[PDB]
């Protein structure tokens, strides 16, 4: 919601490392790989759930 | 995609002169008619083709 007001609507996509742990993700940022991919946000649907975001691999980076 | 970030999304549609030439469109800007019409993009579909824009004639200008 905060990025709706932003002039540039985009989402970064990243890949987690081995031994996925939500607590670790919210605690240590080293779990996520340095490699990532920024992409533009298409549209919010939230048909069944409140988070049904769309992510595509557009601009890779490390 | 570059005008999505723009606060005001709009598009201008002009009229080409007789003897249309695709190369001349990018080579010469005088082929197109002075008269044009500016409007606002409604929404992207891109169902089958990557480019399927919807164009309206809203504000005519010369």
Curated annotation (Swiss-Prot), chains A, B:
Disulfide bonds: none annotated. It is found in: Mitochondrion matrix. Duodenum, heart, lung and liver, but not thymus. ATP-dependent serine protease that mediates the selective degradation of misfolded, unassembled or oxidatively damaged polypeptides as well as certain short-lived regulatory proteins in the mitochondrial matrix. Endogenous substrates include mitochondrial steroidogenic acute regulatory (StAR) protein, DELE1, helicase Twinkle (TWNK) and the large ribosomal subunit protein MRPL32/bL32m. MRPL32/bL32m is protected from degradation by LONP1 when it is bound to a nucleic acid (RNA), but TWNK is not. May also have a chaperone function in the assembly of inner membrane protein complexes. It is linked to CODAS syndrome: A rare syndrome characterized by the combination of cerebral, ocular, dental, auricular, and skeletal features. These include developmental delay, craniofacial anomalies, cataracts, ptosis, median nasal groove, delayed tooth eruption, hearing loss, short stature, delayed epiphyseal ossification, metaphyseal hip dysplasia, and vertebral coronal clefts. The Lon N-terminal domains are crucial for the overall structure of the protein, maintaining it in a conformation allowing its proper functioning. Homohexamer. Organized in a ring with a central cavity. The ATP-binding and proteolytic domains (AP-domain) form a hexameric chamber, while the N-terminal domain is arranged as a trimer of dimers. DNA and RNA binding is stimulated by substrate and inhibited by ATP binding. Interacts with TWNK and mitochondrial DNA polymerase subunit POLG. Belongs to the peptidase S16 family. This is Lon protease homolog, mitochondrial. It comes from Homo sapiens (Human). The chain holds residues 154 to 215 of 959 of the full protein.
């Amino acid at each position: 919601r905060r990025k709706v007001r932003l002039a540039q609507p985009y989402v970064g996509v990243f890949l987690k490392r081995d031994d996925s742990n939500e607590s670790d993700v919210v605690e240590s940022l080293d779990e996520i790989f340095h490699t990532g991919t920024f992409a533009q946000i298409h549209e919010m649907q939230d048909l069944g759930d409140k988070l049904r975001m769309i992510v595509m691999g557009h601009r890779r980076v490390h």
